[PDB]
Design an enzyme around this catalytic site. Structure first.
Site, short mmCIF file in Angstrom:
data_model
loop_
_atom_site.label_atom_id
_atom_site.label_comp_id
_atom_site.label_asym_id
_atom_site.label_seq_id
_atom_site.Cartn_x
_atom_site.Cartn_y
_atom_site.Cartn_z
N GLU B 218 0.77 -1.24 0.00
CA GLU B 218 0.00 0.00 0.00
C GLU B 218 0.80 1.29 0.00
O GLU B 218 2.03 1.28 0.08
CB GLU B 218 -0.97 0.03 1.18
CG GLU B 218 -0.31 0.02 2.52
CD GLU B 218 -1.31 0.26 3.61
OE1 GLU B 218 -1.87 1.37 3.65
OE2 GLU B 218 -1.54 -0.67 4.42
N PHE B 278 7.25 -5.20 27.05
CA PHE B 278 7.05 -3.90 26.47
C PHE B 278 5.83 -3.12 26.98
O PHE B 278 5.16 -2.42 26.23
CB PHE B 278 7.02 -4.03 24.95
CG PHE B 278 8.35 -4.36 24.36
CD1 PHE B 278 8.99 -3.46 23.53
CD2 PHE B 278 8.97 -5.57 24.66
CE1 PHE B 278 10.23 -3.77 23.00
CE2 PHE B 278 10.20 -5.88 24.13
CZ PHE B 278 10.84 -4.98 23.30
#
Ligand SMILES: *C(=O)CCCC[C@@H]1SC[C@@H]2NC(=O)N[C@@H]21
Lengths: 506, 591
Positions: B218, B278
């Protein structure tokens, strides 16, 4: 004579190689090994190595070990003379006898005659029962000495084993008490008697373990992880202390600048007044090489007491912790800082007090507990103190507490304030309800009356118009303001009225 | 060209602002409440509030923005990215004023906005496409046109290394595709460009495979966060050209000109804690010290003393480097990071350092599953190899002595009996002991190990410095130092270990010390302060990181945040906002 060398080496063995292992078994170092790590490598001179007890009861005279349970003598810490005694648990349990105390008194008496600290390494099973009153008298001469030296020469107590009975009262009177996380403990009465008299069943560690004491009783100043760090941290401590009450705090090189600016500070006080911040951030940024040796960290956490240096000189610090109890002052926080202040003063160490207290902690528990007396202790401490006193109010300074926290009325030298400071009789709300009674039935009057008290009194300026705050500064410059403030007070000399001694509340 | 507003904030805002004003252009900005501090605010020549901290009430509200765009007089607003950079409503409201939304035309934006549509628009555009892949490598192309038909590409950036689809490391050019296949992607990229009527600069994302077979996933109609990399080899300022063209203008350089010199690597400093899956990190930045200059570039929207609020993207900085050779840039970076100092929040600095040292990153042989393949268990920490522990040992040993000697210069010492500092030590690293001897004069220090080997430590360092720039065996060693009872806490690469520097007897005895075992944790979060529950930020069956904010009790007009003791999962909750609990009252329960 190599005969001497033998006797010597014989003595060095303590209760024998089998017991030495037992000791090591409990993760505990030996009396001598502890001394070995405490004093400057090869600088220990031992005294009374061949002392033997004078007991004759209970066939005690058939077991006359050399040293009689304690290793005494002197040495240096970073070249400075220090006097020491390490109890040898492997010898008759390091049990206190007439002669064991005598040995301790010899170096206490020597520490005092020469103006040098005394480090006590307690690791004893308690009194030597067979000696009878002689064991009691043994304690007595130590206590007496402990008392006479109070505030005359620093007395650091290290607990690295058991400490039971009258014994506890000695370290009790020294200036510091450090314990070793799991291998140590101390209590006036044993767990077993606690049972037979309270029917309560508790383990020694629960009753008087490092944790119990570093955060519940208010007795220890810190619990170290093990014998090795314990010893290492004690020298660290000693490097800050003066050798006695005559000289002033020691000096040394310092790779930091008295003019350092911490802009980060300008935003430390949160906008929202209900959000804490860690007072300790400030302390580290102000502290010289960011080094901050904290005392009683795990106790009365609503207040912080510790040591730092500035321009390479020792400075004590008392500061409020928003993170706990909203920085309230309470019986325990009071007792905790009060003594710290007094020790620092008794030894010419200046004080830096960082403020942000709302008032005292409300409660039946507090009043019935005697805050009237305990609360006053800290007040008493600052009122009495004459070393140089610099203060910085970061935010809240209300009422009584405001006064207690090294206020200018306690004759502090510098009374600095951050623009976020708010010194006032009490909060805008409460203030208003008292000042404006006939106005409560009009929730817009009092809503506005508060908004005015807030806008007109919650700040540092009314106090500035009065001279109570010598100046309001930019947070980033605190390190610079405070450093030279102290620098200029190095010559400070102030006299308190003559008296045998004080009568501070107990 | 003059008073140009910015619809964004953070690092990007600064990114553009730093360019606007570099070309003498009246800068202007906007900011929510929890953003009056923000570095972009102060970088602009003006600034206007725009409401509360949430952007769905300040940065996105087109009314707000507009009111200010005129309130300060527009001329060319810039959206940066990820906000209104691609939201038509705002794109038209600007034209309904004459404010040149520097970027792509609201049409082409909605064009590549829908997958289906895009699929076709590339087809006849003769743009390669996964028909209907081996080693998937995410490789994108940076193209720039103008509303005057012209348009060219400025190389490609490989962002294969991304976690959970969030990009972590970007580089330019791509260590894989060669010249032909590059222009291949490039020529076709730009071609696709015009085909949709793209104006400013935009990016075309491809999915090259094992055979250099490239496709097309894209196109993003906006400025890419990772553009810095492109800029450090092309010699262009996408933000510059971006306004130039958004201001009816030609391209000063053609395709024959657009040259791509040397290499560039870009890491993203995220306020996330690698050590605890994280988990985002929230808080104030105590120490915040990046590098400065083989180039070194740091795009940041933060400063020391600033705070990272829940109301935005956890990115703290983009640490870009560049050089002639790739190996070079990977190096400047590796050094770069070593000196980046961050305190107050949890961050991925060690993690980044880790991948920079990861062989596969080094060989370039990486796929888009790299992150997932190599770090299946999250960030398991990094641990130094002998010749590393060795160099570090020597340095700590060298530094420790320095500090020790200083303790020796205390006033009040026995005149002829001062403490004399030892020469023999034992440096205890990563479960490894290093009996070492020190000899030092004035220049530096010489550390000798058991095997007859000796390293030479040289350093500026002195107690208190939190960062240490040493020179061991002629080679640079950058360490982060902290005090510890028997030595210090040292941190080099993903490294972070307690380095004990003791004397032989000190060491000999410490070996007799029991091994500490953490305390026990109840699976019940008891309320320690008799207060009122202000807020619970954890749901039932949610997973929590060790130390994660659970709830918040209001004490005496003071908020206290309670947090997870050890990582675990919420069994049940039994209190909510407005609740008032005494001590011990169980707040939550963990399974
Ligand atoms: C707000 O919730 C009511 C005010 C509570 C009073 C607080 S509690 C501790 C502070 N000291 C004090 O005496 N009042 C303050």
């Amino acid at each position: 004579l190599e005969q001497l060398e033998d006797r010597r080496a014989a003595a060095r063995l303590g209760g024998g190689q089998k017991r030495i292992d037992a000791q090591h078994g409990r993760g505990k170092l030996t009396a001598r090994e502890r001394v070995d790590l405490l004093l400057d490598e090869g600088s220990f001179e031992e005294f009374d190595m061949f002392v033997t007890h004078r007991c004759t009861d209970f066939n005690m005279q058939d077991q006359k070990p050399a040293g009689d349970g304690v290793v005494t003598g002197w040495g240096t810490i970073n070249g400075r003379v220090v006097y020491v005694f390490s109890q040898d648990f492997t010898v008759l349990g390091g049990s206190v006898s007439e002669t064991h105390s005598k040995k301790i008194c010899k170096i206490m008496d020597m520490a005092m005659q020469n103006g040098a600290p005394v480090i006590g390494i307690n690791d004893s099973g308690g009194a030597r029962i067979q000696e009878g009153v002689d064991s009691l008298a043994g304690y007595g001469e130590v206590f007496q000495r402990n008392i006479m030296a109070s505030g005359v020469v620093p007395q650091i107590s290290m607990i690295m084993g058991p400490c039971a009975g009258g014994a506890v009262y000695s370290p009790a009177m020294t200036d510091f008490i450090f314990m070793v996380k799991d291998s140590s403990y101390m209590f006036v009465t044993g767990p077993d008697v606690v049972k037979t008299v309270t029917n309560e069943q508790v383990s020694a560690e629960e009753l008087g373990g490092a944790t119990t004491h570093t955060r519940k009783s208010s007795v220890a100043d810190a619990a170290f992880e093990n014998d090795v760090e314990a010893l290492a941290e004690v020298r660290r401590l000693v490097d800050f202390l003066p050798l006695n009450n005559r000289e002033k705090p020691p000096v040394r090189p310092f790779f930091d600048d008295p003019d350092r600016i911490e802009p980060s500070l300008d935003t430390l006080v949160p906008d929202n007044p209900n959000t804490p911040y860690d007072m300790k951030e400030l302390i580290h940024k102000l502290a010289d090489e960011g080094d901050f040796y904290e005392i009683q960290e795990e106790f009365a956490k609503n207040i912080i007491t510790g040591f730092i240096r500035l321009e390479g000189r020792t400075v004590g610090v008392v500061a409020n912790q928003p993170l706990v109890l909203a920085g309230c002052l309470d019986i325990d926080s009071s007792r905790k800082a009060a003594r710290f202040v007094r020790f620092c003063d008794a030894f010419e160490i200046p004080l830096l007090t960082l403020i942000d207290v709302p008032g005292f902690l409300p409660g039946t528990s507090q009043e019935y507990g005697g805050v009237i007396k305990h609360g006053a202790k800290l007040l008493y401490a600052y009122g009495e103190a004459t070393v140089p006193m610099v203060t910085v109010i970061t935010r809240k300074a209300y009422g009584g507490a405001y006064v207690v926290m090294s206020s200018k009325h306690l004759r502090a030298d510098f009374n600095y304030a951050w623009p976020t400071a708010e010194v006032a009789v009490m909060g805008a709300k409460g203030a208003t309800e008292i000042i404006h009674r006939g106005d409560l039935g009009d929730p817009e009057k009092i809503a506005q009356h508060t908004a005015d008290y807030e806008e007109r009194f919650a700040n540092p300026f009314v106090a500035s118009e009065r001279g109570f705050v010598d100046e309001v500064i930019q947070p980033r410059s605190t390190r610079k303001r405070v450093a030279r403030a102290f620098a200029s007070l190095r010559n400070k000399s102030v006299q308190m009225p003559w008296k045998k001694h004080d009568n501070i509340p107990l | 060209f003059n008073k140009i507003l910015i619809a964004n904030r953070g690092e990007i805002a600064c990114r553009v602002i730093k360019t606007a004003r570099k070309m003498g252009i009246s800068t202007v900005a906007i900011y929510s409440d929890a953003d009056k501090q923000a570095l972009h605010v102060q970088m602009a020549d003006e600034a206007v509030h725009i409401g509360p901290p949430p952007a769905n009430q300040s940065y996105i509200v087109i009314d707000k923005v507009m009111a200010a765009i005129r309130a300060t007089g527009a001329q060319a607003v810039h959206p940066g990215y990820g906000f209104l950079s691609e939201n038509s409503k705002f794109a038209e409201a600007l034209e309904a004023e004459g404010v040149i939304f520097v970027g792509p035309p609201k049409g082409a934006i909605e064009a590549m906005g829908d997958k289906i549509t895009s699929k076709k628009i590339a087809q006849e555009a003769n743009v390669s496409t996964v028909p209907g892949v081996t080693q998937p490598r995410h490789i994108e192309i940076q193209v720039l046109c103008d509303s005057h038909g012209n348009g060219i590409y400025l190389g490609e950036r490989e962002c294969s290394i991304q976690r959970r689809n969030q990009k972590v490391v970007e580089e330019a050019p791509s260590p894989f595709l060669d010249e032909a296949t590059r222009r291949a992607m490039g020529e076709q990229a730009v071609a696709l460009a015009k085909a949709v009527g793209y104006a400013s600069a935009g990016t075309v994302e491809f999915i090259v495979d094992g055979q250099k077979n490239f496709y097309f996933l894209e196109m993003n109609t906006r400025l890419q966060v990772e553009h810095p990399v492109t800029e450090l080899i092309t010699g262009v300022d996408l933000v510059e050209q971006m306004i130039r063209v958004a201001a009816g203008e030609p391209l000063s350089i053609t395709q024959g000109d657009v040259k791509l010199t040397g290499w560039a690597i870009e890491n993203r400093l995220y306020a996330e804690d690698p050590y605890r899956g994280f988990l985002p990190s929230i808080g104030r930045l105590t120490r915040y010290r990046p590098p400065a200059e083989a180039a070194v570039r740091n795009d940041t929207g933060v400063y020391e003393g600033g705070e990272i609020s829940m109301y935005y993207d956890p990115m703290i900085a983009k640490l870009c480097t560049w050089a002639p050779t790739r190996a070079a840039a990977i190096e400047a970076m590796r050094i770069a990071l070593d000196s980046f100092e961050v305190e107050g929040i949890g961050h991925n600095l060690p993690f980044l350092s880790a991948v920079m040292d990861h062989p596969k990153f080094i060989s370039g042989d990486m796929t888009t599953a790299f992150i997932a393949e190599e770090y299946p268990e999250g960030f398991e920490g990094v641990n130094l190899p002998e010749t590393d522990l060795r160099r570090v040992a020597a340095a700590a040993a060298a530094m420790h002595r320095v500090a020790e000697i200083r303790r020796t210069r205390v006033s009040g010492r026995m005149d002829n009996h001062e403490r004399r500092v030892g020469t023999e030590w034992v440096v205890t690293l990563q479960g490894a002991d290093f009996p070492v001897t020190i000899a030092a004069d004035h220049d530096g220090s010489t550390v000798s190990f058991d095997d007859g080997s000796s390293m030479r430590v040289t350093s500026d360092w002195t107690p208190g410095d939190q960062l240490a720039n040493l020179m061991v065996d002629g080679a640079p060693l950058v360490l982060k130092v902290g005090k510890i009872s028997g030595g210090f806490r040292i941190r080099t690469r993903g490294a972070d270990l307690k380095v004990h520097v003791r004397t032989p007897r000190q060491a000999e005895l410490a070996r007799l010390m029991p091994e500490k075992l953490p305390p026990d944790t109840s699976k019940m979060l008891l309320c320690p302060m008799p207060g009122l529950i202000v807020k619970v930020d954890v749901e039932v069956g949610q997973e929590v990181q060790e130390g994660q904010a659970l709830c918040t009790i209001e004490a005496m007009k003071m908020e206290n945040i309670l947090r997870a003791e050890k990582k675990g999962v919420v069994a049940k909750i039994n209190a909510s906002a407005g609740n008032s609990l005494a001590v011990d009252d169980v707040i939550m329960e963990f399974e």
